Amino acid sequence: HLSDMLQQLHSVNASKPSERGLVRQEEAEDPACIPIFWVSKWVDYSDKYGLGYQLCDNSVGVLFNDSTRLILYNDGDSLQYIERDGTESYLTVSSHPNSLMKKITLLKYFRNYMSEHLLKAGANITPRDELARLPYLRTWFRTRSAIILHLSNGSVQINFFQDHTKLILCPLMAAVTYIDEKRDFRTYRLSLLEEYGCCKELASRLRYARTMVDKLLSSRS
């Protein structure tokens, strides 16, 4: 649904939400669109192993450098492994093929580091069945200013390094959650931002998001 996201961003940006009359950003909030999942923590160890991350439900995942993925559900034991060719298999930390020993060890290190050392993004929010299929990290990249995280449920999260602000874009809800410098977490319907406007700070970040979605679309493999 990246193409849908691109269309939704074209539409909001074309409405020039910060450049017209009275901004009524609060009227664009839609609590029914609060995301179910976002990335709460991440560790870039890609020069050796991969990108580890925690989702807001306390599950963790790793996208390894060989393009395989391991997902640990928040029960702390149930695992999903996704091979290069896309085959999904289910196992546990306690019961797994010997061939997965190294990758499970790596996941445990990532999980323990994130639990001990990093702040949980969106920590005050209850999100929207903890064994139901989790989204996984489809791809990610970094720029000088941000990390861009594309989840398999279509959501795209952009974390800006310098000011700690974040966007969570969902093309199914056609919504964006903005986490500002004060850690206020607010979810907007994109078409209501068109209707009611928004501040220049959110508008600028939505222009950046469109450029990042074009990058995702032009680099999918």
């Binding site: 923590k41 991440w42 560790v43 870039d44 160890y45 580091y113 050392h117 702040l119």
Partner: peptide
């Protein structure tokens, strides 16, 4: 940065 906040 090589990890989140």
């Amino acid at each position: 940065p090589l990890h989140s906040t």
